[PDB]
């Protein structure tokens, strides 16, 4: 029978993803804080 080997443990796209997630987090946070301020 044929055999195989398993798997286990782009910087531009990586930093894009991390920074976009950061931005989304921040946008949600500033919504919520301004909203509490307003109330």
């Amino acid at each position: 029978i044929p055999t195989h080997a398993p798997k286990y443990e782009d910087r531009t796209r990586s930093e894009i993803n991390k920074m976009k997630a950061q931005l989304k987090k921040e946008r949600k946070f500033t919504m919520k804080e301004i909203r509490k301020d307003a109330k």
Partner: protein
């Protein structure tokens, strides 16, 4: 007097997995295996008996218990037993927590224990691994019950020391033609053999001697090839 098949060139039989539920095959399961992942802070680690004792005590379980070496050598010896080179068996890990890990007969285990443990932790988290092709998943994870995951017409036997000795060659050769075989093997180091009783139809012994789990697996596997003319 009788001709030969149009081809006779060597051609490997296809791998057997849980999707095929017809052809007679061999089902080996490692049971009650001591396998779980904890966190130390910053990273996750699989338990091993010898190396994680302050936190093993903190959790409260037994060093003599939480040993996955047994699993490693058992799994290796099954995977490199001749019957798999004939391509006729597959294995199922019954986790101590309850998970089912079905081990496809196409994998090659990493032989050193640290690499093996890395594989086990990565599997426990991501629930799968792919190969060099990465076109079919290698180590799959599945639900209770094993009976739902076994070939339809099979037998339910657990290799227990107390059970009477029966010669594996004899019993396999008595087994019927489309009668696949599952064997529930207690991997746990030392204790009772009364866990799969509701699944099993009988307990079976192969000697008047106690055995190491891997050695018992090797013996039973050996009888299987001897019956199946390999």
């Amino acid at each position: 007097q009788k001709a030969l098949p149009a081809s006779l060139v060597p051609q490997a039989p296809p791998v057997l997995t849980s999707k095929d539920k017809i052809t007679k095959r061999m089902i080996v399961v490692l049971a009650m295996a001591s396998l779980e992942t904890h966190k130390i802070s910053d990273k996750y680690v699989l338990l091993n008996c010898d190396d994680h004792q302050g936190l093993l005590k903190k959790m409260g379980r037994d060093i003599s218990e939480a040993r996955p070496d047994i699993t490693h050598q058992c799994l290796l010896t099954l995977l490199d037993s001749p019957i798999n080179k004939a391509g006729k068996l597959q294995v199922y890990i019954q986790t101590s927590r309850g998970i089912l890990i079905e081990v496809n007969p196409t994998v090659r285990i990493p032989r050193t224990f640290k690499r093996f443990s890395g594989l086990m932790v990565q599997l426990l988290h991501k629930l799968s691994i792919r190969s060099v092709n990465s076109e079919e998943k290698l180590l799959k994870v599945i639900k209770n019950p094993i009976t739902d995951h076994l070939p339809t017409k099979c037998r339910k036997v657990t290799l227990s020391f107390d059970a009477p000795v029966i010669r594996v060659q004899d019993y396999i050769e008595k087994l019927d033609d489309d009668e696949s075989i599952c064997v529930f093997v207690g991997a746990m180091a030392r204790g009772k053999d009364n866990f799969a009783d509701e699944y099993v139809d009988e307990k079976v012994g192969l000697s008047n001697y106690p055995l190491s789990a891997s050695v018992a697996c090797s013996k039973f596997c050996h009888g299987a090839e001897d019956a199946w003319n390999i």
